[PDB]
Amino acid sequence: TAKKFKVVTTFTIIQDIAQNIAGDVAVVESITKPGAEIHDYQPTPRDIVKAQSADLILWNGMNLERWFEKFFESIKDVPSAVVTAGITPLPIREGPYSGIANPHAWMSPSNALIYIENIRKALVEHDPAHAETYNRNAQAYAEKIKALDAPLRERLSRIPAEQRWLVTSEGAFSYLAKDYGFKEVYLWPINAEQQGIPQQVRHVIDIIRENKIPVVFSESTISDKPAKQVSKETGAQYGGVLYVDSLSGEKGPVPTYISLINMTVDTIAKGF
Ligand SMILES: [Zn+2]
Ligand SMILES: [Zn+2]
Structure with missing residues (x-):
């Protein structure tokens, strides 16, 4: 139990999902703070240092974080992973971004199971010594997400x-x-x-x-x-x-x- 494996995520939703998978064997932090607007966030020098200190960086993709690609150019030797890999986008329907991916894929709990799996895979790949904790935590957390479907649908019925x-x-x-x-x-x-x-x-x-x-x-x-x-x-x-x-x-x-x-x-x- 040295200095723990460190994950940096772009925003808070990914941070919380990833921390549930990580349990107590890794430390997950978000670049953006609770309440901050995430699409057009303006990274700071202290954000570069934080991401550079990570063992793995997680971001949404589907061009959610308009700032990330240019920001990531300042980070060296830290793997990043897109946590929406394998999710089929819904396109934006109107406006100057018509036809771009709607990035808010995490608002479907069935899509969240794919987030969980992409995050589990990344953790297990880059922190193999804790593969059994990640795999256990991911399956347990996925079961918690699946259990939401019935009460949610009933609440709206x-x-x-x-x-x-x-x-x-x-x-x-x-x-x-x-x-x-x-x-x-x-x-x-x-x-x-x-x-x-x-x-x-x-x-x-x-x-x-x-x-x-x-x-x-x-x-x-x-x-x-x-x-x-x-x-x-x-x-x-x-x-x-x-x-x-x-x-x-x-x-x-x-x-x-x-x-x-x-x-x-x-x-x-x-x-x-
Ligand atoms: Zn938004
Ligand atoms: Zn990787």
Whole structure:
């Protein structure tokens, strides 16, 4: 038990999944902090040193971290692994990033089983001395993720199909919405400096009326003002905040990936 194998992840969701697989035999840290916007994060000098100190770096890919490839050029002799390997992307549907991969694949718990497996494989490959702890922890954690499907679907079962409209700020929920049969509407398709600020807002304001959508949400790393505006101009309640791009702090309401999925579905469900 020397100085432990060190994993650095780009953001907090991957950190929590990886730490569950690592147990107490490796130390997993995230470059971005709870609450920080992850798509256009601006790495600092202290971030370079942190990643350079790792034995393995994990990132999402599907161009989630617009900053990572240029950042990784400053890191030497540290293997990196894309934790979405083998996941089939849903494309972004509108806007300046139309046709790019929607990167938010972790919002489907069935996809999370593929995250777990890619992370297990990377740990076992680069830290073979603990292969049996990683393999044990991954199978146990995968069983915890599979056990969410029944309570999640039951939590959402009072909403008839025609009324399953999920109206959010970032279009970050496409994978969750596909899993549980929701139609998505969003104020912007992916986080970015972008045009389309008020024109989508009133296209959304329109969609709310033809379908009498009762609730609209925001997300924890972006501003709630557009969602709150859309709630006032319609008769819809502001239901947010939903969690997708970041966990909370350790003492907050969403300290783990499991708590993130559960609370997001629970908050959707109470909005209806
Ligand atoms: Zn490798
Ligand atoms: Zn996002």
